[PDB]
Chains A and B, each alone.
Chain A
């Protein structure tokens, strides 16, 4: 271990998206991923144990040779920007939009896949893939919040999943950590893409108006 460990730049980004504090109410299986209660009810997620689970999840994706057998899901629409651009980086075959129950089971279906791993985003907003994961013997990484329980989840990353910048940060440092195990760019070297792609875009009340203000 000890050489992939966190630095002051990493926790500068994590504390910027607001993913250190979670929901008011938890899964009971979320016992080990909490540091202290707080006023407002909000729960201080400890960050070394997020990084423990980000350490495994990068080890999970790289473990298979063929990267094109990774299916990545988002049903709710904060990470449908993220999944389509996370997959644009590494090897994943993105299923954004609606899930179409029976994507894995019936062999009479056309748009029909058989991956070796699944990456979902919000386990309460994605109950159908986690149910379908138990039919074709495939493991599942999930970006779990506190109130999200853990049925057919394997690699839970404690975070917030209701925010916009909160979700997309995890996708950024995952793929960066995934590529770091593929052998691309050092720890002791900076990175080239900047996470505002992966995070989210709102309706462009700001985005075209920030481009209209930057005229």
Chain B
């Protein structure tokens, strides 16, 4: 029955969303870090929060915790927004894809630079 309530998890996510720059892997320091940076009106609730946050800490080092992603990963996420390699927008400039798209590219007004040629049977799906 370690089935801790919302208001543990409510604070423990706002623990991680404000002051991550003080927390660590350790329980017996964050049990006293929690006092200096929060308002805990109960002494069982001192332990109950602090055991959950340090149990959450071994996931934050490990994987993305969905409720809020930390300030490394936000800008870090942008890092995955602006990764620009400039090679493979396009293949070769003589594409051959379909005999049907030859009737496209001839009859729709172009120069028709790239030839198209495959053939198949018609037993599709």
Hey, which bits of chain A sit against chain B, CB under 8 A? 8, 11-13, 15-16, 20-21, 24, 35-36, 38-42, 44, 46-48, 81, 84-85, 88, 194-197, 201, 207, 210
Contacts and interface: CB of A to CB of B under 8 A. Distances in A.
Secondary structure call for the B interface: loop
A194 B89 contact: yes
24 contacts: A8-B110, A11-B110, A12-B90, A12-B93, A13-B89, A15-B97, A15-B114, A16-B90, A20-B104, A21-B98, A24-B124, A24-B125, A35-B100, A35-B104, A39-B122, A40-B120, A40-B124, A40-B125, A41-B124, A44-B101, A196-B88, A197-B83, A197-B84, A210-B85
Closest 4 CB pairs of A and B: A16-B90, A41-B124, A40-B124, A39-B122
Interface of B: 80-86, 88-91, 93, 95, 97-98, 100-101, 103-104, 108, 110-111, 113-114, 120-122, 124-125
A201 B104 contact: no
A47 B104 contact: yes
A39 B108 contact: no
Given A39-B122, A41-B124, A41-B125, A85 B104 contact: no
Contacts of A81: 81
Contacts of B90: 12-13, 16
A40 B110 CA distance: 26
A201 B124 contact: no
